[PDB]
Amino acid sequence: SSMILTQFGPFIESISGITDQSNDVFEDAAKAFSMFTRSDVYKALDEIPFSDDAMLPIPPTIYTKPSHDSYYYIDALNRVRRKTYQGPDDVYVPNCSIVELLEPHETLTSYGRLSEAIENRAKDGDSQARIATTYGRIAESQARQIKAPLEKFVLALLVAEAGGSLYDPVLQKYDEIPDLSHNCPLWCFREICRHISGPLPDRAPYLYLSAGVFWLMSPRMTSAIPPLLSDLVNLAILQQTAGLDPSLVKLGVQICLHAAASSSYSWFILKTKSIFPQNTLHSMYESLEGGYCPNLEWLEPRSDYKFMYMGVMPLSAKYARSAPSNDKKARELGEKYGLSSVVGELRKRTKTYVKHDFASVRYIRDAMACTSGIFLVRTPTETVLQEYTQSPEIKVPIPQKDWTGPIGEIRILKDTTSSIARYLYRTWYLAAARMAAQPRTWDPLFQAIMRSQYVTARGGSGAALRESLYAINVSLPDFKGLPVKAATKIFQAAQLANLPFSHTSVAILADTSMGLRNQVQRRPRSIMPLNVPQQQVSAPHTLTADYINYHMNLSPTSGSAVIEKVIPLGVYASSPPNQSINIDISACDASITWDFFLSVIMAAIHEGVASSSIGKPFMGVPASIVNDESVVGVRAARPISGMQNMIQHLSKLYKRGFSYRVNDSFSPGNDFTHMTTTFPSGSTATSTEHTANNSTMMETFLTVWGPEHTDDPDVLRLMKSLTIQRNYVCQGDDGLMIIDGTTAGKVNSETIQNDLELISKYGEEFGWKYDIAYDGTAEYLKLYFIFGCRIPNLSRHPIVGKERANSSAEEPWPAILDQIMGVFFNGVHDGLQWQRWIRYSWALCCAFSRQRTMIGESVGYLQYPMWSFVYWGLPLVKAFGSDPWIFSWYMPTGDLGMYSWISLIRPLMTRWMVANGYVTDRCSTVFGNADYRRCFNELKLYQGYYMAQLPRNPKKSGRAASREVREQFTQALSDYLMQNPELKSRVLRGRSEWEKYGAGIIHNPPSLFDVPHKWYQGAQEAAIATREELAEMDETLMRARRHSYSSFSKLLEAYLLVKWRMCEAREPSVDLRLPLCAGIDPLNSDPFLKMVSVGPMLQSTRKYFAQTLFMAKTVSGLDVNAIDSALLRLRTLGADKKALTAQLLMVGLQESEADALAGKIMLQDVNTVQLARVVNLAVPDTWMSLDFDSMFKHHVKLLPKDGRHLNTDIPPRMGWLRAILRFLGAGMVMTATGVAVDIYLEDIHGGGRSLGQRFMTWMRQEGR
RNA sequence: GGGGG
RNA sequence: UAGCCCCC
Ligand SMILES: Nc1ccn([C@@H]2O[C@H](COP(=O)(O)OP(=O)(O)OP(=O)(O)O)C[C@H]2O)c(=O)n1
Ligand SMILES: Nc1ccn([C@@H]2O[C@H](COP(=O)(O)OP(=O)(O)OP(=O)(O)O)C[C@H]2O)c(=O)n1
């Protein structure tokens, strides 16, 4: 460690709280990181005096592996395939030798790539050559699922840990996290690699590059080493930063060693991934003596997902695990995969926890951080053949006799059907009618928003559409000469803009291109990039599904994103007396087929939508005639609406199936079109659709089936007390059945077990295999809960991991920084040990802050000052002679955050600056007599500040665009959007109205007329950048670094005029013995103190924020937050109502709605959060898990502590100031380490009035 | 672009 | 060729 100490000495102390941070040391540390050679990191690793406890037997078979050749074969269709041995799952990358297939690299003679000879033979068509190429390309792919070379993360860890234990400012003692000599993962990493390199001078087992992966030419290297090493590094970092129990961590290493010792690392990982969760989380408290859990009340209406904390629920034996024991299956699993030693140890330790508390949840969390974090990989061919093959077993089909004769592509489900489909059909029919009945549905704007949803910069099987169209002699415009990417639905929209639906209808049946996605702890999933006409025609399906979800059930719309996964719901559901069943449906997409679901859904919508859609087109789709054969004998023609025409065309596609075009670039010669009946993922209907069926069937079970299939009084009573509107929350195929508890305790476990078994049997009737789980735990949207405590899963957030489905190279340098910041933010949300995590993050950041640049022998270097990271959100450890660790990771981002940390030490800074020569006679309002301008330019604080705000990726705008084709394109886009003259007429009105009442007040008027331009830009910025555009990006960053400044942004200079007084610590908002988030306990002072004093966010963040906008949606391309900001700004700038009415007309509203919302906005008392947007202030993401609403309202006093001040008084017409002022106070409170404190407005330099004018100038100048 | 179903 | 839905 002397090697590390010498090279990063001063920097190490700067990030350990011992010495101040300085850009000079930081940049040198950066240069040192870049000058360190890979092999040096290993040499550094050798310098570590590892303890015996950090060692464990390493399997010799991890090095000696068979040839890959017996693991593959050519199938009947000539595709290269993986040959199974351990089951139908054994389709991943096998653990084999690989050096025999490599050619030494010219220069790195010890490293090699796949023999060019072998690929050439493979390309010629040689079976053996193809097999070898496939293996080589997929093994390479497996090794690319990381963000950057492992050595960088390791070096970072060495540098960070060289600082020793950290002194907690709050607890006033050093932490007791074992040093690296006790880190088993690192030891293994060094040994495994050393053993591989053997006598070779090169210590790296492989090199992650841009030109591709290269393997160390050693007979001991295996295709399984990259994944193994990647798991070890994560575990190594986590043991030091999450303060994980070392003994547990070793268990995680053993599993990984076993995975590398097996015949397939990924496969083995997939089969054993439940070990830690099953033997801890799902086995906790078989016995229970005490502890406390939350006591929440679910407010009304439950749909708001709003809860209120009511105290603590004392625990006792009464609440011990009552759910069935998983011991047997868990042990069988361990025995089957050679891990019974691990399962047994976990089972034993889990039993020792008889109290539910911080210690016990941290144990679970720790255990669950040890699961491999690799993104499983297998060839595309394998994913497609495993996911689009299995078909649902409909044990009780809809009788053929129950369908009427056809009505085009659909058949009505006779109302005399005794089938359970009866209910599924009624729900979709009902919702279809109500949806189509809504007036908004027939508003040109609404239909523009819908037509604009799928017009995006992402793909849409562009090539297949062009050819399915060529098949009927219809050639689309090619716009020869435009600098935009052609494979975008945006390009598609422009091509189709001026063609009647009848000419593009065939495209609805065009093939579907391949799209893949790798996941952690899961298998790769195939994706279907539907084309514009396919997405268009899917509208009715999507809208009806949305209507069901908004009006008929209890569901959360989104994908996930911590807190957006409604944390509050899990706390409630998992807290005794309450209990929850974690319902999930396997093979969801493959279970939604025409045989039972789609034929019924298509029918119900087609019919229920009839009367209100009659005699009318929809979203560009015309009405038409179709053959009618409903009645027997009677055969006529039937007029249907455009909406019905859509269902008509969509039904034709759902019936036939999807032609998936598979071009497997990892498997030479594996080109085939696979037909499948599995439901599309890339469809706008997918998510909402599955959510709707989920609740609909659960409703039918609880209302009909269940009751009719049992006479058991308790079960009948239990089911009767459950409602899909009050007790069942779902999204897609995930479900959470919440059984509220009584004073008599919780509902009988045996009665619950009966209900579940019936649900299970119930789904077999229509092809659904319910994955039900009753284990005393709550699991929803990959969020884990036990006894009201959230258990972050560190396993799913691989520090070094990064999904990479395609072969394309990683984005140019700059890009990596956003990823590193994301790694930091995940740690904040996962609750790692704040100091250890912050210090490590500074090391990591420093190690990626420098890049070598080229301009033609013009070898320079791009360096980001430490200050850029602060701007991005990374808190300072110690600066300007301040105490160490005074800054919390809840410090805001950007200007708000800069304001916060600077205000907390304004005086320290001023004093430091003067005592170091930065003095002047001019007395600064913020920094007194400190020559701040000279200081900030020299320290690179201004530089870093501005560099952080520059594009971290090449720009394509400015590419020579031949004006004529450029106008044709944007015209096509315009016609697509402005199809309906009514809409256009609306915007033109807003326009001339704007010139009279709004023009001049603000300069950011959002307008539908901009969309075509924003769409063009999007298609542009989607294309591959050139090396020139790259240089241009660097030059920009480098010019900002050279330039010298005299101030911060106009908004930051304005906030700095405001001063506060931090006062009394707040009282606890929740009980301090209450486990809310594992890892967030008295051992993690700042996070814990913030959680306790500020309080947890007990409402859904989606619901909360939906109340901070006047309009929820708008045409894709415009920014809802932008529209909201313009309206409020106009109001704040004294604009007349007619001006807001004009703004609203320009974004598509009818004059009546426009005038109404405008008049409504004028007289409204706007909330802190919504109002703060007038100046671009947003609630920080890191704050989302806390009760920031309460902080703004009751703990940021705008009235000075000692009464009113002339400067602090808020002018009559400037009440909007209070919202901005609330954010600034909150900033300082949240940025200060420790307990949330009450803060009092102390001063505003030039007074409130002048402050307001200052903000009003910023407002009216945006976009000039 | 980032983090997540 | 590389989809859809969400927090900044
Ligand atoms: N990028 C993504 C990720 C997920 N999904 C959707 O999420 C839904 C279900 O999620 P999973 O549980 O992850 O998919 P399953 O096929 O059901 O996996 P298996 O039963 O193992 O869980 C269906 C799928 O289309 C999606 O459209 N796009
Ligand atoms: N002032 C410097 C010089 C080099 N590098 C880093 O070095 C790496 C590759 O170049 P080297 O071959 O390692 O640089 P050398 O200067 O030739 O090595 P040193 O003096 O020991 O010889 C990439 C580049 O960013 C750097 O960050 N800053």
Ligand SMILES: Nc1ccn([C@@H]2O[C@H](COP(=O)(O)OP(=O)(O)OP(=O)(O)O)C[C@H]2O)c(=O)n1
């Ligand atoms: N913004 C960037 C990114 C990369 N390059 C050029 O790309 C070439 C090699 O790519 P890298 O592998 O990304 O650069 P290295 O210095 O070899 O190391 P890495 O980015 O970790 O620093 C050399 C470098 O000048 C550049 O000029 N400007």
Ligand SMILES: [Mn+2]
């Ligand atoms: Mn599922």
Ligand SMILES: [Mn+2]
């Ligand atoms: Mn699921």
